[PDB]
Amino acid sequence: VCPPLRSRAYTPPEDLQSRLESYVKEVFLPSNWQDISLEDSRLKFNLLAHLADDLGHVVPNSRLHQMCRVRDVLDFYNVPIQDRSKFDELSASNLPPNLKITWSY
């Protein structure tokens, strides 16, 4: 049975650095954990899979190679993505009173 479709909307959590460093400690320690290199496949998979399970939002294959460091992972996860259609993006954008938009699709 198909589960309810996962909404692609994602708002980065406020305690995101804390959660990320907790996961980094769980997976891997030294000072400046931002600069920990993910050249190891095991460690990269563990960290990214944990983050994907926890936040409901995975790094796409296209961006997977540019996650060279925990800093890169943090940058990827602190950028929001909204799944609202263009209809919503326009209508909920403070339309002037003389502008009317309707969608029949």
Add this chain to the structure above:
Amino acid sequence: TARGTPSRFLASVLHNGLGRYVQQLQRLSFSVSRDGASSRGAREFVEREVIDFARRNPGVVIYVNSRPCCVPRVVAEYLNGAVREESIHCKSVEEISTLVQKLADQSGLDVIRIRKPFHTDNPSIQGQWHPFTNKPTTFRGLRPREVQ
């Protein structure tokens, strides 16, 4: 050609400049398709320019249908009842912007040959010429060769 085309005289709608200027464009209707390359420029215009145009022209009600019939279009309705339909098929964002601004600037009067480049309701201040202007009068109004 002029002879194979209707013509009119220069005119305004309701003496549009005497007391105040009233923008004659009152309604714009953009029929735009979600999919279809023909309305890509229209989609970008709706995304980037229609809001600014709407707030620049508060007297014009703008509708965006997002489901057209045939080609994507903009229907401009004017105060005098004129309806001008312009296809925005395969037009770029800037092309559509210029077209919409032209619709906003023009009046609803037909774009046909205009007979005169001017229109006066009072062409004469000193009195229109008639054959008896500049003609001197004669004593007792005697016409030429009149005996008395």
